[PDB]
Amino acid sequence: DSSNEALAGTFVIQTARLGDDSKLSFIGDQNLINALSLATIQEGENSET
Amino acid sequence: NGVYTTNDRAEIQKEVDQLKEEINRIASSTEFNTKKLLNGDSTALWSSDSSDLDVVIKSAVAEGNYNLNVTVDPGKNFVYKSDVMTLNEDAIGAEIVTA
Amino acid sequence: SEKLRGQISGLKRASLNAQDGISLLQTAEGGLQNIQDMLQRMRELAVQAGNGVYTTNDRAEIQKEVDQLKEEINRIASSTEFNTKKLLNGDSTALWSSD
Amino acid sequence: ILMVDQELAQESITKLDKALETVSGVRATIGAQINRLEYTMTGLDTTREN
Amino acid sequence: TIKVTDAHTGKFIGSDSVNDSTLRGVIQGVDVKIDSDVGVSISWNSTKKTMEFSATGESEDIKLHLVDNAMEMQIGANEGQTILANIPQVDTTSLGIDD
Beta-carbon count within 10 A of E65 CB: 19
CA distances from B15 to A26, B8, B11, B18 (A): 19, 11, 7, 5
Hey, is the C-beta of D26 within 8 angstroms of any chain C C-beta? no
Q: Which of B5, B83, B86 sits opposite C83 (nearest CB)?
A: B5
| CA atoms of C26 and C18, how far apart (whole Å) | 13
Hey, is the C-beta of C21 within 8 angstroms of any chain B C-beta? yes
| CA atoms of D30 and A28, how far apart (whole Å) | 47
R_g of chain C computed on alpha carbons: 23
Distance from CA of E99 to the nearest CA of B (A): 23
Distance from CA of A2 to the nearest CA of D (A): 30
- Say how far residue C36 (Cα) sits from the centre of its chain: 9
Exposed, middle or buried by CB within 10 Å (0-12, 13-18, 19+), for C61? exposed
Residue of D3, D5, D6, D11 for testing the chain A interface, max A β-carbons within 10 Å: D5
Long-range CB contacts (< 8 A, 24+ apart) of E25-29? E29/C93, E29/C94
Residue A19, SS3 per DSSP: helix
H/E element, A39? strand A39-42
In SS3 terms, chain C reads as CHHHHHHHHHHHHHHHHHHHHHHHHHHHHHHHHHHHHHHHHHHHHHHHCCCCCCCCCHHHHHHHHHHHHHHHHHHHHHCCCECCECCCCCCCCEEEEEC
Contact D3 B13 (CB under 8 A): yes
Distance from CA of A6 to the nearest CA of E (A): 7
Q: End-to-end alpha-carbon separation of chain B, Å? A: 60
Q: Which residues of A touch D9 (CB under 8 A)?
A: none
| CA atoms of B58 and B56, how far apart (whole Å) | 7
| CA atoms of C81 and A33, how far apart (whole Å) | 18
| CA atoms of E96 and E33, how far apart (whole Å) | 12
Inter-residue contact E31 to E23 (CB < 8 Å)? yes
Q: D35 φ, ψ to 5°? A: -65, -40
Beta-bridge partners for E67: C95
In SS3 terms, D1-50 reads as CCCCCCCCHHHHHHHHHHHHHHHHHHHHHHHHHHHHHHHHHHHHHHHHHC
Q: What is the resolution of this structure in A?
A: 4.1
Inter-residue contact A35 to C91 (CB < 8 Å)? no
Hey, is the C-beta of E71 within 8 angstroms of any chain B C-beta? yes
Q: Which residue of B has its CA nearest to E69?
A: B2
CA distances from E16 to C31, E12, E21, E27, E33 (A): 37, 12, 10, 11, 13
Rama region for B38: left / alpha / beta (φ>0; ψ in -120 to 50; rest): alpha
Q: From which experimental method does this structure derive?
A: cryo-EM
| CA atoms of B36 and B30, how far apart (whole Å) | 6
Q: Single out the residue of C59, C84, C67, C47 nearest to residue E92, CA to CA.
A: C67
Inter-residue contact B13 to A40 (CB < 8 Å)? no
CA distances from E32 to B40, C30, E2, E21 (A): 64, 29, 11, 9
Contact D6 E79 (CB under 8 A): no
What does DSSP assign to residue E95?
H
Q: Which of C7, C13, C98 sits opposite E65 (nearest CB)?
A: C98
| CA atoms of E43 and E54, how far apart (whole Å) | 8
| CA atoms of B69 and B64, how far apart (whole Å) | 17
CB pairs under 8 A between A and E: 16
